[PDB]
């Protein structure tokens, strides 16, 4: 019972964006998929729904002119196209099965979200540098190590460790904005210091807007 | 009173 | 437009204490013929999508722990966490599905009130790979501290710096309720070569004086 959205994108003012929502794990044609957006600091904001079966749509009055929701029943996928993009349109765009409350079933499922940035600035993939453990990165039997993801645009980058197997001790910091206009963030994990010689520690860095998938081993 | 078309999944 | 208003905007309580969030809808959410309130509550941890907690004003969704309960009818609604656990840190939204357009409240941020914890300070010299590109980032790390207020100062050759660092603070930890902060000093390669001592000085309530971490570029 899952919804999987396409990756984050950057567009030029006046251009269009086309987000997608792939569904699986349930009867696709039985329910309606909504589109909600979360701007930075603003409350969640409903845009419209589409009936997955027959394709009928209703749109919020704020987005009547510029939104179009569609669906392809064969691939189990819904789409949301927003045209004439403006600065206010920088937000995370979710698709969700909002409160499916039927006599037979009751569930609620959201896609992970698609960050859309409206800017004339160019996409740029990050450089991935190691933050190596050392004598100045240890305290009381643990060692701190991480990755520095510098100089990318737009947000976001995702950082995992050892492909998701290492999660304890992990802190991924919010991105900082540099005067250049490019973003930068750090991801750090604290691990046992005794076993730095036998264990392997890899940052997995994903920046979909620039098709960047990087695996950086971090060694002393 | 409630609008059945507000959310068709209810 | 049913305007959903929540009170308060921020709530802070100790671990285990009762927490209550109030939602007021601008018109009635009750359909008297079926006696149902068209109102739901969502939880949103940072970096995740919202999570449905309560629907029909008071019906809890399977999977949601028992300590979450909803009540109220008409235009006044309450979400109660009878015993706040660390992972309950999040923003909580009420939501009405009574009228089009669907609307959400402005969210209520719930925070934990925690004992003081001094930070663990670490510093990282720039990797050699980054210096090939002519730039040098010096990263200072303050791990797992409380309260969130912390001051970081950079020193190069014992000289206080200004204008060349940036900071970032995590969300509150779901497990121990602490924060973490990373400060990054960025310099050109040449400027970094010009100096020997790079130091990070941290001031926090759990420390009786500032702490300094430093390395020599060699």
Residue located via tokens 């392809």:
A72
Q: Are C201 and C195 in contact (CB under 8 A)?
A: no
Same domain, A136 and A108: no
Q: Are A11 and A17 in contact (CB under 8 A)?
A: yes
Exposed/middle/buried for residue A170 (C-beta within 10 Å: 0-12, 13-18, 19+): middle
Same domain, A45 and A149: no
Pairing of strands A183-192, C10-14: unpaired
Contact yes or no for B3 and C101 at CB 8 A: no
DSSP state of C194: H
The domain boundary, picked from A119, A145, A163, lies at A119
DSSP state of B8: T
Alpha helices per DSSP H over C39-90 = none
Determine the length of chain A.
220
Exposed/middle/buried for residue A200 (C-beta within 10 Å: 0-12, 13-18, 19+): exposed
* Structural tokens at position A169: 């001790």
- The distance between the two most distant Cα atoms of chain B, rounded to a whole number of Å, is 17
Beta bridge partners of C77: C23, C72
Report CA torsion sign: A21, A22, A23, A28: positive
C68 contacts: CB under 8 Å, gap ≥ 6: C41, C53, C54, C60, C79, C80, C81
Same domain, A126 and A87: no
Same domain, A154 and A171: yes
Q: How far apart are the first and last CA of chain B?
A: 14
Q: Cα-flanking dihedrals φ and ψ of residue A56, to 5°? A: -65, 145
Q: What share of chain B is helix, strand, coil (3-state, %, to 5)?
A: 0, 0, 100
A86 contacts: CB under 8 Å, gap ≥ 6: A13, A118
Q: Are C213 and C200 in contact (CB under 8 A)?
A: yes
Q: Cα-flanking dihedrals φ and ψ of residue A20, to 5°? A: -130, 155
Q: Is A162 helix (H, G, I), strand (E, B) or coil?
A: helix
Pairing of strands A77-82, A17-24: antiparallel
C-alpha span between C200 and C212 (Å, rounded): 5
Same domain, A44 and A93: yes
Residue located via tokens 């190596």:
A132
Q: Which residues in C lie closer than 8 A to residue B4 (C-beta atoms)? A: none
The domain boundary, picked from A57, A89, A119, lies at A119
Task: Find how far residue C163's CA is from the centre of its chain.
Answer: 26
The total domain count for chain A is 2
C-alpha span between B3 and C1 (Å, rounded): 12
Tell me which residue range forms the domain holding A8: 1-119
Same domain, A63 and A135: no
Alpha helices per DSSP H over chain C = 128-131, 189-194
DSSP state of A105: -
Residue located via tokens 């001051």:
C151
Cβ contacts of A108-111, under 8 Å, gap ≥ 24:
A108/C40, A108/C52, A108/C55, A108/C61, A109/A1, A109/A2, A109/A3, A110/A3, A110/C49, A110/C50, A110/C51, A111/A3, A111/A4, A111/A5, A111/A21, A111/C49
Q: What residues in chain C have their Cβ under 8 A from chain A's Cβ atoms?
A: 40, 49-52, 55-56, 61, 93, 95, 97, 100-107, 120, 122-124, 126-127, 129-130, 133, 137, 139, 141, 143, 166-170, 180, 182, 184, 186, 213, 215
Report CA torsion sign: A113, A119, A124, A130: negative
Angstrom distances, CA of residue A158 to CA of A22, A211, B7, C88, C182: 20, 12, 33, 23, 17
Q: Are A50 and A78 in contact (CB under 8 A)?
A: yes
Q: Which residues in B lie closer than 8 A to residue A49 (C-beta atoms)? A: 7-8
Same domain, A169 and A179: yes
Same domain, A16 and A115: yes
CATH number listed for the domain at residues C114-218: 2.60.40.10
CATH number listed for the domain at residues C1-113: 2.60.40.10
Same domain, A134 and A78: no
C-alpha span between A61 and A94 (Å, rounded): 18
* Structural tokens at position A11: 């567009």
Q: What is the resolution of this structure in A?
A: 2.4
The domain boundary, picked from A91, A119, A147, lies at A119
C-alpha span between A148 and A188 (Å, rounded): 9
Contact yes or no for A184 and C105 at CB 8 A: no
- Of A145, A36, A149, nearest to A98 by C-alpha is A36
C-alpha span between A214 and A206 (Å, rounded): 7
């Amino acid at each position: 019972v899952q919804l999987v959205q396409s990756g984050a994108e950057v567009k030029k003012p006046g251009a269009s964006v086309k987000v997608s929502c792939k569904a699986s794990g349930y009867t696709f044609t039985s329910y309606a998929i909504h589109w909600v957006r979360q701007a930075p600091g603003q409350r969640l904001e409903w845009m419209g729904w589409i009936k997955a079966g027959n394709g009928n749509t209703r749109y919020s009055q704020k987005f009547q002119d510029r939104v179009t929701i569609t669906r392809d029943t064969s691939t189990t996928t819904a789409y949301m196209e927003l045209s004439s993009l403006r600065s206010e349109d920088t937000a995370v765009y979710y698709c969700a099965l909002l409160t499916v409350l039927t006599p037979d079933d009751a569930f609620d499922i959201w896609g992970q979200g698609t960050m859309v940035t409206v800017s004339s600035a160019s996409t740029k993939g990050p450089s991935v540098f190691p933050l190596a453990p050392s004598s100045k990165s240890t305290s009381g039997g643990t060692a701190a190590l991480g990755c520095l993801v510098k100089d990318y645009f737009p947000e976001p980058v995702t950082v995992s460790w050892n492909s998701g197997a290492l999660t304890s001790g992990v802190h991924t910091f919010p991105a900082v904005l540099q005067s250049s206009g490019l973003y930068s963030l750090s991801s750090v994990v604290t691990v046992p210091s005794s076993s730095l010689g036998t264990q392997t520690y890899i940052c997995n860095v994903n920046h979909k807007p620039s098709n960047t998938k990087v695996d950086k081993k971090v060694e002393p | 009173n409630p609008d059945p078309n507000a959310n068709p999944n209810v | 437009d049913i305007v959903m208003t929540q009170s308060p905007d921020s709530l802070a309580v100790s671990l285990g204490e009762r927490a209550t969030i109030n939602c007021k809808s601008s018109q009635s959410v009750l359909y008297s013929s079926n006696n149902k309130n068209y109102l739901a509550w969502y939880q949103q941890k940072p970096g995740q999508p919202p999570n449905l907690l309560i629907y029909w004003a008071s019906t809890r969704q399977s999977g949601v722990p028992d300590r979450f309960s909803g009540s109220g009818s008409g235009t006044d609604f309450t979400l109660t966490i009878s015993s706040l656990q660390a992972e309950d840190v999040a923003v909580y939204y009420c939501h009405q599905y009574y009228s089009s357009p669907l609307t959400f409240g402005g969210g209520t941020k719930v925070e934990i009130k925690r004992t003081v914890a001094a930070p663990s300070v670490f510093i990282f010299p720039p990797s050699d790979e980054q210096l090939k590109s002519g730039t040098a980032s010096v990263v200072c790390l303050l791990n797992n501290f409380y309260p969130r207020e912390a001051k970081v100062q950079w020193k190069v050759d014992n000289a206080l710096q200004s204008g060349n660092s940036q900071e970032s603070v995590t969300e509150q930890d779901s497990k121990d309720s602490t924060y973490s902060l990373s400060s990054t000093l960025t310099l050109s390669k040449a400027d970094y070569e010009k100096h020997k001592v790079y130091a990070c000085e941290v001031t926090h309530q759990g420390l009786s004086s500032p702490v300094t971490k430093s390395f020599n570029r060699g």
